[PDB]
């Protein structure tokens, strides 16, 4: 049976994406650009901070100096760090706490395999830190899209081979990263968005220990 579960943060454990939307909107207002709304924020999903900022400037066909660009980018991040002080245990997605408890009670290792620069802080805010055996550090290993490195680091950090591990992800490039790590992916979301070949659940409430087991046993057969 699998010895570890490697968790993505955003889309699996919780939603960081709403706080980002509020950070960008605050910057947009602050510099006087209309049109940053939930509809527009959807075009920032999986987009770099620098690309996202450029798209916001494009709303007013605005050109800024490289130094100004850099200061706006920084301020969005400051806004974000400010927004996320309100993260709490109410942000934890359904099923996730029970899963962590069940994994832990069965001595299965729990690692975070996230590109989030605020991972440890966010796990603290959500009161999940005690369940986590390691957090892979994205500053040390490339967690840039589809790189298995973050997943490989997360497995190793709890003393297992990726081959002994399940990875949970909500994005196609996440699922690819898990596969190239040698871990077994289980996706959360819509068939249409993730892939033909992999097991997928429609939401995090379906991530149960019993279900992960059944999937591990059907990989092995």
Q: Which residues are annotated as a binding site for beta-D-glucose 6-phosphate?
A: 10, 46-47, 49, 116-118
Min dist CB 138 to Mg ion, Å, is: 13
DSSP character at residue 11: T
Q: Which stretch binds Mg ion (CB under 5 A): 10-18, 58-66, 93-101, 102-110?
A: 10-18
Our CB check for Mg ion shows the closer of 149 and 170 to be 170
Is 8 annotated in the active site? yes
Contact 152, 172 (CB under 8 A): no
Of residues 131-190, those binding Mg ion (CB under 5 A): 170
Q: Tokens standing for 105? A: 């009670």
Q: Tokens standing for 175? A: 């699922």
Residue among 8, 78, 149, 196 flagged as catalytic: 8
Comparing every residue's Cβ against Mg ion, the nearest one is: 11
Our CB check for Mg ion shows the closer of 10 and 164 to be 10
Min dist CB 96 to Mg ion, Å, is: 13
* Binding-site residue set: 8, 10, 46-47, 49, 116-118, 170
Instruction: Check binding of 8 to Mg ion (CB under 5 A).
Output: yes
Which helix (DSSP H) or strand (DSSP E) does residue 109 occupy?
strand 109-112
Min dist CB 163 to Mg ion, Å, is: 22
Which residue from 4, 5, 6, 10 is in contact with Mg ion, where contact means CB under 5 A?
10
- Give 118-121 contacts, CB < 8 A, sequence gap 24+: 118/16, 118/81, 118/84, 119/9, 121/84
Buried b (16+ CB within 10 A) or exposed e, 51-68: ebbeebbeeeeeeeeeee
Q: Which positions touch Mg ion (CB under 5 A)?
A: 8, 10-11, 170
Active site residues: 8, 10
């Amino acid at each position: 049976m699998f010895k570890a579960v490697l968790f993505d943060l955003d889309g699996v454990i919780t939603d960081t994406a709403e706080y980002h939307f509020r950070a960008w909107k605050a910057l947009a207002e602050e510099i006087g650009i209309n049109g940053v709304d939930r509809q527009f924020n959807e075009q920032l999903k999986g987009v770099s901070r620098e690309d996202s900022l450029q798209k916001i400037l494009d709303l007013a066909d605005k050109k800024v100096s490289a130094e100004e660009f850099k200061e706006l980018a920084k301020r969005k991040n400051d806004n974000y760090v400010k927004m996320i002080q309100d993260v709490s245990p109410a942000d934890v997605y359904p099923g996730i706490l029970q899963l962590l408890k069940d994994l832990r009670s069965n001595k299965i290792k729990i690692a975070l395999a996230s590109a989030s620069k605020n991972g440890p802080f966010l796990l603290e805010r959500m009161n999940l830190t005690g369940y986590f055996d390691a957090i892979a550090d994205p500053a040390e290993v490339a967690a840039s899209k589809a790189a298995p490195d973050i997943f490989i680091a997360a497995a190793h950090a709890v003393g297992v081979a990726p081959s002994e591990s399940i990875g949970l992800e909500d994005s196609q490039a996440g699922i690819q990263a898990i596969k190239d790590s040698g871990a077994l992916p289980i996706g959360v979301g819509r068939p249409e968005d993730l892939g033909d070949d992999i097991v997928i659940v429609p939401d995090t409430s379906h991530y149960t220990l019993e279900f992960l087991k059944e999937v591990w046993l059907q990989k092995q057969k």
